[PDB]
Design an enzyme around this catalytic site. Structure first.
Site, short mmCIF file in Angstrom:
data_model
loop_
_atom_site.label_atom_id
_atom_site.label_comp_id
_atom_site.label_asym_id
_atom_site.label_seq_id
_atom_site.Cartn_x
_atom_site.Cartn_y
_atom_site.Cartn_z
N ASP A 100 39.09 31.10 40.42
CA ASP A 100 38.15 32.27 40.73
C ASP A 100 36.64 31.85 40.30
OD1 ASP A 100 37.54 35.05 39.20
OD2 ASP A 100 38.81 35.36 40.86
N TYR A 231 29.91 38.65 37.60
CA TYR A 231 29.38 39.26 38.56
C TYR A 231 28.05 39.80 38.70
CZ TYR A 231 34.50 39.57 39.71
OH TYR A 231 35.71 39.54 39.90
N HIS A 292 46.11 35.16 45.34
CA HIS A 292 45.07 34.69 44.73
C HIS A 292 45.20 33.92 43.32
CE1 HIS A 292 40.78 34.52 43.56
NE2 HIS A 292 41.06 34.98 42.32
#
Lengths: 318, 316
Positions: A100, A231, A292
């Site tokens: 990730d 983010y 994922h």
């Protein structure tokens, strides 16, 4: 065998570290929303193959420092954490393992300090060399301001819409996995198939109950502000990443993702096309019906490829 | 020879570029308070020797963009400028030349992209490995808050202290050079001997008049806010530079500085000892009775060492 925990003061923060084994060092870096516990199976596997597995909670997470300020979560900060950690352990060099945001930050770390990070084992997020264009800029000019999920995550209220860990951790584990029904799987450009949807009942067998419980407890205490700050830092970081505009990673690498990972929609290239950018790539892997969470959905074959990779890196390094 | 000028869109800003010659690329980086014109004698000398000299106004100076925000003046921002400049010129690699802040940022650029910056020729500012502490906390911890000049340059009001370029540019060319009486030359830890004391009459003959006039003209039009942002950025940049904590520069390297440069006080190492952070250092020259402005005080010496260095880097 057996995992040990401690805390390290590095790079102006406190870093919670877990480790197991002895031999060459392997640094594991998790992403959103995960913890060091995500790697227990791989740590135990490589420890019994003669390696030192070292897996911190990355900054923002777990029992590590989680500064409020999103500008502190660029790859420059976490690479500084990983350097100061290797320094504090008196380790000369380590192989990097990332998943990730950990994979993104790890790719950067390998660019910045190949003298210290001698190989990179990347999961889910492929290396894309830096471009003329940040991802946020392309999404905006092509109209995806309300569609590209990262914008939803960057909003300050994302703290609140993730906060209910008992629901959102099983949910993201389910909806970004190869277990969710096809067409229902999370997709980064669909606001209706969000990452944080409640799971529709019990988690698939691949999701280890001890891991799911551990992460629910961690994120009920911490909240998600630091994780989500990864983010918020990515676009400000486009300015500071300009030195690596065309930069390539030349140390040995390896890449695995799942073919049911909604992330693939943002990387429409083949594994052969990842060597431009990763010329030291020793091999890739696309797993059928994996989403994922590859180190849980395909725990044993991740452990396996990592063992095989490390041995090949050993041979190259010698 | 024949010097030409143009602007390049790179890294989200405008870069004013001067250049001369053809051949392998040599990329010059000036510091404070300077402009690309500081390299003209070296540019001409290496043009005659077969090299393409490229000397931009660094960001914050001259005809280059000069954003107000100090956060935009780290080595990350200037290396992005240089990578994007080479890209725009479709040059694969270059040797770095840097003086003053240009040297510090050239050092950092060599660290970040050895694939594009193949050698480092530094002036006045030696490379020292980033350590546990910035120069800023060492000075605080040791009681120099009112002595260390950078604290004064960092002040917002330093824009106004410098602004009279007709005064401050000859001022710093004199007081930080070998021509000032020793004991009166600028010192980074002496309040009473600042860099912007006016000059006593006309500048020493070594300060070329076309160079002095060029810089006064540019700083009258721009002011010094952009340049001073290089100091205002160093401390915050310390947090961003933690990746490179032990990092050494392995490319071939050369270092020149002047014995009478007050900056010697800040780097009490021997040039033998500079091999630690610069393992590919092929030579270091300390120049007698030369101060900070080595490329002007000893223009012919700097030019001849750079031609020799480039020829040695080429044959390897």
């Amino acid at each position: 065998g057996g995992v040990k925990e401690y805390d390290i003061a590095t790079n102006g923060i406190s870093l919670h570290v877990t480790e197991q084994g002895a031999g060459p060092a392997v640094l594991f870096c998790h992403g959103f929303p995960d913890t060091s516990y995500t790697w227990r199976r791989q740590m135990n596997a490589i420890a019994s193959a003669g390696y030192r597995a070292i897996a911190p909670d990355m900054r923002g997470y777990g029992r590590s420092s989680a500064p409020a300020d999103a500008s502190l979560y660029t790859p420059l900060h976490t690479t500084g954490d990983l350097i100061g950690l290797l320094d504090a352990l008196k380790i000369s060099s380590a192989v990097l393992v990332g998943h990730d945001w950990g994979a993104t930050h790890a790719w950067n770390a390998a660019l910045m300090r190949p003298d210290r990070f001698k190989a990179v084992f990347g999961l889910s997020v492929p290396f894309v060399t830096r471009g003329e264009s940040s991802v946020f800029e392309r999404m905006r000019e092509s109209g995806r301001q309300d569609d590209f999920y990262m914008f939803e995550q960057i909003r300050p209220d994302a703290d609140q819409i993730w906060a209910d860990a008992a629901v959102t951790i099983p949910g993201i584990l389910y909806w970004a996995s190869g277990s969710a029904p096809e067409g229902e799987q999370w997709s980064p450009l669909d606001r209706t198939r969000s990452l944080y949807r409640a799971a529709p009942g019990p988690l698939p067998s691949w999701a280890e109950a001890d891991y799911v419980a551990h992460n629910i407890a961690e994120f009920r205490r911490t909240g998600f502000h630091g994780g989500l700050n990864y983010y918020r830092a990515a676009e400000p970081y486009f300015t500071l990443s300009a030195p690596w505009k065309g930069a390539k990673i030349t140390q040995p690498s390896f890449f695995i993702w799942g073919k049911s990972d909604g992330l693939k929609e943002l990387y429409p290239f083949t594994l052969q096309q990842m060597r431009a950018g990763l010329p030291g790539l020793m091999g890739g892997l696309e797993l059928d019906n994996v989403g994922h969470w590859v180190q849980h959905e395909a725990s044993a074959e991740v452990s396996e490829q990592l063992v095989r990779f490390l041995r090949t890196v050993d041979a190259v390094l010698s």
